[PDB]
Amino acid sequence: KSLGTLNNPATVQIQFAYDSLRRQINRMLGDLARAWCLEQKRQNMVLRELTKINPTTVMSSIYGKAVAAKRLGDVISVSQCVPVNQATVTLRKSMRMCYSRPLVSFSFTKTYEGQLGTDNEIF
Amino acid sequence: ATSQYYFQSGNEIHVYNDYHHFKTIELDGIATLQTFISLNTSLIENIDF
């Protein structure tokens, strides 16, 4: 009996090329993953620091949807955002908050008068 | 008036209402916000020619 050698001296060298290129790419991915981990750790601190100023905008961006929040302590509580329909908008042309935000009124849902906020949100 | 503050110190959470405390909760008693936008790259497979 004998072992059936095939006259294909190229299979072994093709395997080395794939194996060699696989080893280096996997090492680069590991190095990149470590760097991203450190960056995300720092970004967590910068997000907590900014939450102490304007909690509503920071929380909305994190969620991806319009929400409401209020920091009454070291734990931030998130409330639910009730929307309104475009039925009534008032834009007074005089400002006399020190008359900074315009005095506006709306109706439907409920109706009231107030000062226009930011990002199409009304008080 | 009503004053819900609930600080945190060490491995303990002290809850205060109306300038008074009545409860103590562990850290796991409250869910933790997460912000970890992360890659989902996968290592390349192994092939036997």
Partner: peptide, 30 residues
């Protein structure tokens, strides 16, 4: 995208706490 809303609510609701130490995921093997 962003609809008009007059919520302005700061009552009791869901609570959330910021993490203090992020655990780094790992994928090493073999």
């Amino acid at each position: 995208s962003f609809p008009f809303r007059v919520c302005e609510l700061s009552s009791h609701g869901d609570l959330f706490r910021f993490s203090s130490d992020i655990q780094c995921p790992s994928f090493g093997t073999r």
